[PDB]
Amino acid sequence: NLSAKVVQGSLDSLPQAVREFLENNAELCQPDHIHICDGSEEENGRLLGQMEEEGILRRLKKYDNCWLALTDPRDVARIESKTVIVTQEQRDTVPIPKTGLSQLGRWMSEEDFEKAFNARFPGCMKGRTMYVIPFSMGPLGSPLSKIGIELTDSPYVVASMRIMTRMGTPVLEALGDGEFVKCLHSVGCPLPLQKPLVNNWPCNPELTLIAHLPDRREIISFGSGYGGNSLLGKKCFALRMASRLAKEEGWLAEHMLVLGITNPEGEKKYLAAAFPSACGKTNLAMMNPSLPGWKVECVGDDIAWMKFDAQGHLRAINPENGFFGVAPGTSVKTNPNAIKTIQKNTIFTNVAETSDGGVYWEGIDEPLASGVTITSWKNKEWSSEDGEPCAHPNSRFCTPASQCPIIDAAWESPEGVPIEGIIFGGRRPAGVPLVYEALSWQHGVFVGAAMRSEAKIIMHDPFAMRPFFGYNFGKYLAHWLSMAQHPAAKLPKIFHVNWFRKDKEGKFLWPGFGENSRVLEWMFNRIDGKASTKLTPIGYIPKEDALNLKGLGHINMMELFSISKEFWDKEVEDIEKYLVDQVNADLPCEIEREILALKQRISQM
Ligand SMILES: CCCCn1c(=O)n(Cc2ccccc2F)c(=O)c2[nH]c(Cc3ccc(NC(C)=O)cc3)nc21
Numbered sequence: 361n362l363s364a365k366v367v368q369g370s371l372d373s374l375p376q377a378v379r380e381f382l383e384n385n386a387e388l389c390q391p392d393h394i395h396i397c398d399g400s401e402e403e404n405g406r407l408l409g410q411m412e413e414e415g416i417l418r419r420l421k422k423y424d425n426c427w428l429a430l431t432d433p434r435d436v437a438r439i440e441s442k443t444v445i446v447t448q449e450q451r452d453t454v455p456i457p458k459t460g461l462s463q464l465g466r467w468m469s470e471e472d473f474e475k476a477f478n479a480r481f482p483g484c485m486k487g488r489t490m491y492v493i494p495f496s497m498g499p500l501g502s503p504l505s506k507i508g509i510e511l512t513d514s515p516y517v518v519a520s521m522r523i524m525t526r527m528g529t530p531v532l533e534a535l536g537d538g539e540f541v542k543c544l545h546s547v548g549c550p551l552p553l554q555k556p557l558v559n560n561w562p563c564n565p566e567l568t569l570i571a572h573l574p575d576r577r578e579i580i581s582f583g584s585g586y587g588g589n590s591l592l593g594k595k596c597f598a599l600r601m602a603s604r605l606a607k608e609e610g611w612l613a614e615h616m617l618v619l620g621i622t623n624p625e626g627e628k629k630y631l632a633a634a635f636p637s638a639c640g641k642t643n644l645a646m647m648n649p650s651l652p653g654w655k656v657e658c659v660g661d662d663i664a665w666m667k668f669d670a671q672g673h674l675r676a677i678n679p680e681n682g683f684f685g686v687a688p689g690t691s692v693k694t695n696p697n698a699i700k701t702i703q704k705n706t707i708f709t710n711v712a713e714t715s716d717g718g719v720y721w722e723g724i725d726e727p728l729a730s731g732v733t734i735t736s737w738k739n740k741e742w743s744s745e746d747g748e749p750c751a752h753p754n755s756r757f758c759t760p761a762s763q764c765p766i767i768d769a770a771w772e773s774p775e776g777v778p779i780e781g782i783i784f785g786g787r788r789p790a791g792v793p794l795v796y797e798a799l800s801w802q803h804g805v806f807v808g809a810a811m812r813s814e815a816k817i818i819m820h821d822p823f824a825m826r827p828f829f830g831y832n833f834g835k836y837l838a839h840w841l842s843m844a845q846h847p848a849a850k851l852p853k854i855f856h857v858n859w860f861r862k863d864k865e866g867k868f869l870w871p872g873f874g875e876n877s878r879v880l881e882w883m884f885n886r887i888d889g890k891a892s893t894k895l896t897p898i899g900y901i902p903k904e905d906a907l908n909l910k911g912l913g914h915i916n917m918m919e920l921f922s923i924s925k926e927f928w929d930k931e932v933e934d935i936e937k938y939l940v941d942q943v944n945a946d947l948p949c950e951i952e953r954e955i956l957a958l959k960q961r962i963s964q965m
């Protein structure tokens with residue numbers, strides 16, 4: 361009866377709990393066929409070919425095995441306003457704010473979710489194939505790795521999941537009869553189609569809903585096929601669900617790149633960094649450093665799972681298998697390693713296409729050859745006078761991590777890499793120096809808590825996790841604070857960076873990019889106890905002449921590193937207001953103390 365629908369694999373080979381998850385949802389969604397993914401190259405080639413037929417993907421003939429998907433303009437991004445966590449008690453998910461609506465999460469009652477679920481999923485896959493994606497977050501078989509099963513009616517999701525996760529039969533074999541996170545996804549357009557189909561990309565914007573049910577170990581997503589909404593291992597699983605598990609089991613699931621940096625003497629450290637959007641996070645993750653003798657290597661560009669080892673060192677793994685990177689602004693100058701990575705075996709979404717089957721986007725910094733023309737992401741002839749970008753601002757490459765020329769040798773080690781420094785950062789046109797260092801662990805947690813960044817609007821994004829907290833942010837802060845009482849903890853040094861400070865004409869004070877190796881150099885030596893410190897009210901900055909400026913043009917170091925009482929009076933008042941308002945009864949006393957200490961330090965300047 362159900363075996364009759366199966367077009368690849370066998371129900372009898374699946375572990376019982378996987379079979380039952382499949383059976384329950386096939387009955388609910390009523391797909392025409394079941395395809396159990398094996399993750400093989402042969403399967404991938406076949407789905408691409410099928411997606412090419414149906415106009416889902418176009419071949420990019422300039423490259424080896426590269427493909428382009430164009431979406432419905434209504435479905436172009438991860439959508440927070442349609443994203444919820446479902447728990448019995450609201451407080452477990454989000455703090456009750458003093459005023460307004462919480463910006464720290466979006467809670468939906470179990471009752472409300474059942475209704476919303478029943479209004480969407482029954483019969484949602486009629487006319488489509490349900491794909492069964494067995495995937496591992498983290499190196500196959502590792503202590504810190506977790507496995508999920510994603511059922512989807514989207515072949516784009518399957519092919520993207522193959523890159524972004526370890527996917528297929530080896531995962532089922534590692535899983536056996538173990539636990540897994542249940543992931544259910546549908547584009548929400550059963551056949552026959554009730555509504556027009558734009559660029560062969562099905563979506564249901566009106567009913568779009570991305571839900572998390574932590575107690576059930578379930579992620580349920582409806583109506584969007586795009587990145588953060590559909591690739592369920594990434595944000596939904598590896599950040600939201602995982603951060604909750606992390607708090608319960610004593611580890612951390614964080615929105616952090618991980619890189620390894622080696623000095624000219626062969627000494628190597630691993631660093632983690634959390635940035636909000638529009639900060640060049642991926643660029644830093646695979647930075648080509650300007651300083652002679654230095655090496656930078658990439659562990660991951662988005663997510664880090666961290667746990668104390670037996671000697672109290674924080675060990676990170678990258679739970680992803682690829683990079684889901686923003687395309688526009690990617691060039692040989694801004695990210696030479698990302699450019700090499702994406703030359704082959706890569707899926708691009710919503711970028712432009714050149715007439716010779718290449719890709720294009722704003723800031724690609726690549727002059728077109730004579731007679732080459734550009735088709736935009738809206739399938740229109742494009743010119744620079746059109747007054748709209750050739751690529752969507754949120755357009756993507758989706759690319760294997762193994763292909764990064766500077767992929768770290770330990771990027772898949774099951775034991776993880778030891779983190780010696782955590783870097784918080786933002787885009788701040790005024791007031792905030794290029795780099796500073798936390799005064800203590802408690803102060804460091806507060807620095808993460810206080811993060812704000814220019815999106816012409818400056819908004820708060822604490823730990824870069826604001827859209828991603830799996831649970832009460834107040835409890836998340838308490839969890840971070842508790843790391844200082846972990847026996848023999850070797851706590852990472854905490855820093856804050858701003859690449860984006862401007863002079864009064866809005867010119868950037870710091871050249872940045874590969875020159876940010878100089879800032880990493882200072883952090884590196886600080887971790888090693890170098891007396892390169894000068895104390896300020898906000899933390900330590902580099903002493904006079906301590907930052908390595910050899911080979912640079914003139915830098916206005918005085919403005920770059922200036923700390924104004926006026927600016928910081930306003931800053932701390934804004935930080936206090938936001939944290940007391942938003943975190944309310946759940947704000948740890950250690951953070952209250954750091955807010956007041958900063959105020960006192962500022963008042964004395
Ligand atoms: C979302 C787009 C972010 C782009 N981006 C950016 O991505 N990084 C981060 C970064 C890039 C490459 C390597 C490492 C790294 F950390 C910067 O340091 C940076 N500075 C700046 C501002 C800047 C600074 C200087 C200049 N030009 C000149 C001549 O100085 C142009 C722009 N943009 C950066």
Ligand SMILES: [Mn+2]
Nearest residue numbers: 615661662663
């Ligand atoms: Mn991210």
Ligand code: NA
Nearest residue numbers: 437438439754
């Ligand atoms: Na987005």
